[PDB]
Structures are given as C-alpha cells and as structure tokens.
Amino acid sequence: ALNTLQTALTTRDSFDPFASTRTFNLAMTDIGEMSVMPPLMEALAQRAPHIQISTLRPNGNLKEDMESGAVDLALGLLPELQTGFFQRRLFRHRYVCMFRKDHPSAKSPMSLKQFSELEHVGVVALNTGHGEVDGLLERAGIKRRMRLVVPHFIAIGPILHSTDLIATVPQRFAVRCEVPFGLTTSPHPAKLPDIAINLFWHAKYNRDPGNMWLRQLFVELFSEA
Amino acid sequence: DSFDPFASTRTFNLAMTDIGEMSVMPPLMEALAQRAPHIQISTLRPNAGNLKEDMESGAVDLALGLLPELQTGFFQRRLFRHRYVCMFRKDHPSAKSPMSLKQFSELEHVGVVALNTGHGEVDGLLERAGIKRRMRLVVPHFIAIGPILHSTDLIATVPQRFAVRCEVPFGLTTSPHPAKLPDIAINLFWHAKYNRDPGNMWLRQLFVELFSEAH
DSSP: OOHHHHHSOOOOOOOOOOTTOEEEEEEOHHHHHHHHHHHHHHHHHHHOOTEEEEOOOOOOOHHHHHHTTOOOOOEETTTTOOOTTEEEEEEEEOOOEEETTTOSSSOOSSHHHHHHHHEEEEOOOOTTTGGGGGHHHTTTTTOOOEEESSSSSSSHHHHHSSSSSSSEEEEHHHHHHTTTTTEEEESSSSSSEEEEEEEEGGGGGGGGGHHHHHHHHHHHHHOOO | OOOOTTTTTEEEEEEEEHHHOOOOOOHHHHHHHHOOTTOEEEEEEEESSHHHHHHHHTTEEEEEEETOOTTTTEEEEEEEOOOEEEEOOOOOOOSSSSOOOHHHHHHEEEOOOTTTSSGGHHHHHHHHHTOOOEEEEESSTTTTTTHHHHHHBBBEEHHHHHHHHHHHHHTTEEEEEEEEEOOEEHHHEGGGGGTTHHHHHHHHHHHHHHHHOOO
C-alpha cells in the first residue's frame, strides 16, 4: 500500500525507442518463442534498432524476478501470477492435426477413427497448456499408438517430414511448419479445448514508459481480441 | 539373451539435447519404420536431472552428447563432431560466405545460451578471444533460430548439424565460421550393466550405422 504511493512518486525513466539501448527480458515457452520472436524482431528492426532482447522459460522464480524487474514481461498461461500482476489477453491456441503433404493415408478433415488408426509423435510440453493434451485424449478414451514421445516441439517439423507419423499441435506452431517442412494440417477430430494466452507485467512497471511501449507493441502485433 | 527387432514391443528411452533430437530423430524414426515397426521411442533432455541413476537402473537406455560426467560405470563410442558455422538468410543484404571476422563483429547476432551443453561454451570462448558481437537477441534454446533468421538480418553461430536441417526449410545459407571455436565430439553412452543387453546392442548398432562418421 505504501509501495503503490512510492512507485507513483518516482520519476519514471524516459523511453525513446529510436535511441534506447535497454535490454528487455521476456519469459515465454518454446511455442511462444517460435511464434512471437520472428515478427517481434522484424518489427523492432524498424522501431527500436538499439535495444537488446533476451528470452527465458517460465519454468526462476518468475514472480520474484518480475517484481525486481529482472524480467519485464511474461507470455503464457501463468496461473500463479495473481496479486501484484496486470494481465491482458492476447490470443488463443487451437489444436490441429499435422502430417506430411503426401502422406499415404491421412486426410483433411481427419476422422476420429483415422486419428486412432495412425501412429503419433507426442509432445510432453511439461507444465504448459500443451502438456494437458495427452491426459485429455487419454481421459476421453481416445486410443493413440504413441510411436514416439519427445519432451518439446523443436524436432516435430523434421520428424513429420521424414515419416508417416501424425502430431497434435497448436495451429500457431503448424503455421510456422507447413511450408518449411512440406506439411499439411487437418482440423482436429477430438474435442480439444483452446488455451487462452495472456501477457503479464508487474504493477511496479504498469506505468514504466519502456514496459508500456513494448507491451503495446505485443498487443499491436499479436492481439486477436 | 537375444532380441527380435521386427516383433519387439520394447520402449527405448534416449537422452539427447534439442540439436540431437532435431538431427537424429528424423532418420532414426525413418529407419525404424522398416526395421522395428512395433517398438516405442521416447526421448528426454540430459538436464532433466539424475541421468547417471536412470541409466544405472535402466530407466534411460542410451545418452547422446557431450556428457563429461558419464565416466565410471559407462561405456562410450564416438559418433561425430559439432563444427560451428555462421548462418543467415539467403538474400541477406550484406552477409557473405566465407564470412570475415570483420563482418562477423559488425553484423547483429542472435545468441543461444544452450545451458550445460557444449554449445553453451560459445559465448565465453568468443569473449575470451576478444571477438565482439552485438547481441541483439539472446534465446535459451535453438527452436526459434531458423524462423528468426528468415525474418531478420541477424546472424547466428550454430552447429553445422543444426544448419544443414534449417537451410532449405527456412531459406538460409551458411558460412565457415571466422572464429576458432573448437569442434565438439559427440559420443553415444550406455551403462555397463547394459553392455551385453541384446536390445540395447541392437539400437547402438543402428545409431552407428546411421550416424557414425568413422569412414
């Protein structure tokens, strides 16, 4: 409470995007990183040619590092960031089926029956919303032949390219993969709910001009709301 | 005892970095499609702690990498080396191959921390050699590198094994690296208790066949 007044009393640091040499530290998952970072850096080349960016995984501690200001912004599903945090809804993950373009049998739209006949690569994606996919399919009684399981998304494009495996992936991932790896997608035959992704900042930095500048750029580039 | 690949139902568990996963798993799964149609594979990162223990106990069958801590109780066999190259988009406005040290220190970089791996040594090495870099972006892992280089004028120092997987998909080209970054030897590792396990031996020989650069 006395903090809120002290944070308001301080003369806020000037932010000139053309001249700033500030480093912004951003927490996001490997999916957020492959999705946001290319167009973010593309925009920043034209908007703020001298700042530095670095990213990290949320899984820190994030809460404490955001209060100190060691981490500027966090993107994801971060249930623990509650008191002292502002948040804003950016976009949703929708899950699709992905497989190579000239797959011998896979169809779009894929049926639930075909989904169950084909072989899968699964992604564990521990402590993320993508991590709930396995449990969701299992609980629904949807059988999958789990031919390969990997912990993270990096190898999925090249794996699907070279095999007749299919994958359950967020559409934002699939979109970065379809052309580079000669892949197609189908809408997903199971009942997978969306994951709503938010951008988070600490209240200490709610009126920090640099922070405000960067988060508005995230809204501008990525907001679907 | 003995082992039948064409009818085995065994799950093998394999420890591997993200570079390892992205380079070995496509041709590995491709081979297995024919040779072992019924086995299961799962992978994990070495730094998802207690690898020694999980290898001793047979929870993890094989490890791939530079894993200096795997000594007594473990066998190892050299498969190949990492050579560092410079990578950037094919229609980059100014970047040339072979790239000079001058251009290297003038262009802007994306760096990969790759903590607790051989690749994690790059930053310190270049620094101690007094090679300057404008670190415009630092990311912890390699997943976003291809798309980042495609959409920017950034350049990256990456293992050639990564680069060769990214060049055509992302429209990138590579250059020999102007610095003197040492090559990194990549070994296959297995626990002594599993030296003569027939399933393990069979998978090890398949790694050798697909990946060894000996000849």
